Chain length 137, copies 3
């Protein structure tokens, strides 16, 4: 496997629908959709240790985590949560998220490495799944 690399997006579906579900307002959703159009994803994997940077021209996020070990990050909409990543399999990690404070839709995300040079990111907010596909830059 090895997720390491710079990734660029090629396909995306249900991203706005996912934001609507998380109650992001129309103005913020418009900015998010425009910015998520050309992100730059940098991933660094050394064993079960990952570093994932996701840059856009308006908002950038960086996560550091070790698989199977709980850590703190934020939901797509900017809410702080407790996250635990695990290997569903050799090439697919799954992440369950739990909100530190407040109520909200149930969220998670998965990252998978295909055998043909793609990285698939799925993000779920209750019953809405956004799928984004990337290739090495």
């Amino acid at each position: 496997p090895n997720f390491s690399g710079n990734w660029k997006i090629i396909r995306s579906e249900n991203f706005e629908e996912l934001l609507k579900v998380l109650g992001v307002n129309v103005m913020l959703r418009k900015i998010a959709v425009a910015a998520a159009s050309k992100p730059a994803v940098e991933i660094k994997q050394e064993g079960d240790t990952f570093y994932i940077k996701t840059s856009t021209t308006v908002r950038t996020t960086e996560i550091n985590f070790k698989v199977g070990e709980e850590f703190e990050e934020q939901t797509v909409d900017g809410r702080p949560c407790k996250s635990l990543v695990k290997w569903e399999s050799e090439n697919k990690m799954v992440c369950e998220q739990k909100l530190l404070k407040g109520e909200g839709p149930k969220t998670s995300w998965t990252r998978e490495l295909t055998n043909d040079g793609e990285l698939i990111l799925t993000m779920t907010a209750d019953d809405v799944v956004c799928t984004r596909v990337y290739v090495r830059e």
Copy 2:
């Protein structure tokens, strides 16, 4: 008293009117209004020493200050200023702001802790006062 805690907003009035006064353009005002809708305020008080973080999905500000002692921050619209906070009373601090460079409307802000679990933030730009009320998250 003790301002410490995570606060969420419940009421707000005259925020856009305040921005208009500070000459913020319509596009920026629209983004500001959309982002200020659900901020996350983190406050840490240890004596007369405060740390106030105000996060939104687009722009986040952090201030560190000791009451009665001049420090450097920015106006709501992003202009650098010299600020001095003082206790108007036991539960209310007042902040006078003076622009480092340039001319502009006279600005200030006050934070007050009520006896019923609310934090009140007022922000003034000349004769416009924006009032925002928060409760513990």
Copy 3:
């Protein structure tokens, strides 16, 4: 010469046209145009060593470089590039940019100090030149 100082803008032309050329989408272009309206440029020069901070209420960039020595920054649109600055003359430095990864329009920027208290910034994206003029704040 000596570029050091805080600069405010007085004139600007072709900024949106330049962004269109770089393929920035309409939403991002609208936000960029609104934010670039009142930036705050801080420049620090100690010999051939420069530090240029450009703040706006939405996005801020900082570059550190030594003239004639290659360094890493980003294009106006947020793309990482290898940059080498050189003195075209006593009061004018020129910067050629080369994209780390991917294809794109040919970009560069120049900064010039006039004899009447202005700083001129030109930015080029292929055959579009944006000119921005500043004065000391």
